[PDB]
Amino acid sequence: KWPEPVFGRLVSPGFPEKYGNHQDRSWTLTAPPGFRLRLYFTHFNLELSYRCEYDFVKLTSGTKVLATLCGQESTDTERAPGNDTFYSLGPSLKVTFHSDYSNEKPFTGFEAFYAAEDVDECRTSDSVPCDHYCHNYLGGYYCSCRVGYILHQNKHTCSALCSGQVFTGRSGFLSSPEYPQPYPKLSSCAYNIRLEEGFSITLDFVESFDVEMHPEAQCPYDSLKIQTDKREYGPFCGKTLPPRIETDSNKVTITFTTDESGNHTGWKIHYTSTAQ
Amino acid sequence: KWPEPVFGRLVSPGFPEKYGNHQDRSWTLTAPPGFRLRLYFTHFNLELSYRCEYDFVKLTSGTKVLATLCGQESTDTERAPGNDTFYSLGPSLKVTFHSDYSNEKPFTGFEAFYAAEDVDECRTSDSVPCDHYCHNYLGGYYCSCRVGYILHQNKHTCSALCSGQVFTGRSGFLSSPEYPQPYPKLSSCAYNIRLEEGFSITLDFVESFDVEMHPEAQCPYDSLKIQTDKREYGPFCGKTLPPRIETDSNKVTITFTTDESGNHTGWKIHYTSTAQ
Ligand SMILES: *[C@@H]1O[C@H](CO)[C@@H](O)[C@H](O)[C@H]1NC(C)=O
Ligand SMILES: *[C@@H]1O[C@H](CO)[C@@H](O)[C@H](O)[C@H]1NC(C)=O
Ligand SMILES: [Ca+2]
Ligand SMILES: [Ca+2]
Ligand SMILES: [Ca+2]
Ligand SMILES: [Ca+2]
Ligand SMILES: [Ca+2]
Ligand SMILES: [Ca+2]
């Protein structure tokens, strides 16, 4: 029915007595997904050989050779456990004991203990899986984002809430989120300047303009586009303030989309109005 | 069927918007046995009052008042969470939000996250539960002992393997385990000096003698007794070398028992032989 927590004890054959010659032991330990295995030795004493060729206790996790332990104390070519802690790479860990044909001294083998352990994905690896807040739990983790933001479909990146602010004043200011700091990733901002009939809106790119532009592809990454009831403008990208735009419309919509990477600082617009 | 891992998110009513007046919220979070709850705030902003009387977020674990959180920053009489981490005392934790009748400023409440977590009984508390080796695992722990020792019935203390060494030489030395260091707890040592018919064994308490003795009860704690086929000797306890014992036997048995506490260094005996 319900599965017991994974933990146990591994020893050399006949422990605490001496271990024999021509012996082989192997254990394949497996934790649930989201869990890894913690292993350590309370006792260790084997035959010393170059690269631990003769007798050895090897720890592997799939293809990765985690350890090859021999002797009593570590050398420049051989390693002894001591009270060090060994962790599996993933939920799996294989432990193998081997002895050759002879043992000059009565080497007394090993005693080691293991237990399943929750992987803390929030502290593992400077390569944070979460854009804003990381939340760890037994056998998993998830991301959240701060105020004015929402968790993206990818369950990691945090998109800004920068859509649906309607401007109705004769003049005002628009800007990418966090301006003049780098605008957030995978965000879709929608600005709507709606004025009464008889007015014309004018847009002025002020201060700074830094939307991600890469060579001979124009703006396939981040895109700043302008739409009126008469025409379209954009996509505007680059590092130079775009020229003044005198729309002959009382309603103007500005859309700003971003990709998955970049530290570009964005844009800022001052809009004004004139009468007929 | 199978129970999901315990984790979740708790917020003030209407979060991220302002929280209202005359509101009350309560959550009783419970982890499995051997697990505790980890709680932290990503957001916190409440009304400040003396000892957080008006509005508050209180954290309790049974009877223990873990926290009473108010305001924005901590004072000398009030506390704000910040990015501090709060742990439950046991598998249970109650979280209570309360607001009074009025809020002068638009206080915007809180956002907090929680998750179940394995209690590490081996690192918790200088009051180690295990005598020798402590081994932690998900939802529990157990003890083991080093070589020459075995785990006692109490699953914690480690008794010495000091029984059944037969002496057959004309002379030799006996001693409490780890002598001249403090003898182990809850141990039962049995020494057997067996010689051929025609010999008489003599016992000499040498060097030092320190068996736990407490006033006017003689030796009810640790007991060193001697048995021959003619009589008995002991129990010997105290801080003075006991007098020489000339047994008229070729077989002598010495039994040494210990209790659950003490740093007494024990005893050492030199036995010899004479002919008829
Ligand atoms: C661990 O530490 C103890 C105490 O320092 C030492 O006696 C022992 O050799 C070390 N290594 C192992 C494998 O126990
Ligand atoms: C946590 O730390 C951040 C960054 O220093 C800070 O802005 C915030 O006020 C702190 N407290 C909470 C509850 O987030
Ligand atoms: Ca060998
Ligand atoms: Ca996890
Ligand atoms: Ca970008
Ligand atoms: Ca209030
Ligand atoms: Ca535990
Ligand atoms: Ca004692």
Numbering used by the authors:
A (entry chain A), B (entry chain A): 2 to 126, 129 to 279
Sentences from the paper on this structure:
In particular, MASP-2 CUB1-EGF-CUB2 (subsequently called MASP-2 3D) was crystallized in the presence of citrate that chelates Ca2+, and although Ca2+ was bound to the EGF-like domain, the CUB1 and CUB2 domains lacked Ca2+ and became partially disordered as a result (Feinberg et al., 2003). Because there was no structure of rat MASP-1 3D, and the existing structure of rat MASP-2 3D lacked two of the three Ca2+, including those Ca2+ that form part of the binding site for MBL, both rat MASP-1 3D and MASP-2 3D were crystallized in the presence of 2 mM calcium and diffraction data were collected. This resulted in one MASP-1 structure at 3.7 Å resolution and three independent MASP-2 structures at 2.6–2.7 Å resolution. For MASP-2 3D, 279 of 280 residues were visible. Interestingly, the three structures overlaid closely, with RMSDs of 0.682, 0.871, and 0.992 Å over 276 Cα atoms. The only notable differences were in the N-terminal seven residues and in a loop within the EGF-like domain (Thr125–Ser130), probably reflecting flexibility. A major difference, however, was that the structures now contained three bound Ca2+ compared with the single Ca2+ in the EGF-like domain of the earlier MASP-2 3D structure. In the MASP-2 CUB1 domain, Ca2+ formed contacts with six oxygen atoms in the side chains of Glu48, Asp56, Asp101, and Asn104 and the main chain oxygen of Ser103 (distances between 2.3 and 2.7 Å). In the MASP-2 CUB2 domain, Ca2+ formed contacts with five oxygen atoms at the side chains of Glu215, Asp225, Asp262, and Ser264. The firm identification in this study of the three Ca2+ sites in rat MASP-2 now resolves a key ambiguity of the earlier rat MASP-2 structure (Feinberg et al., 2003).
The lectin pathway of complement is activated by complexes comprising a recognition component (mannose-binding lectin, serum ficolins, collectin-LK or collectin-K1) and a serine protease (MASP-1 or MASP-2). MASP-1 activates MASP-2, and MASP-2 cleaves C4 and C4b-bound C2. MASPs are homodimers that circulate as zymogens bound to the collagenous domains of MBL. Each MASP comprises two N-terminal CUB (C1r/C1s, Uegf, and bone morphogenetic protein-1) domains separated by an epidermal growth factor (EGF)-like domain followed by two short complement regulator (SCR) domains and a C-terminal serine protease (SP) domain.
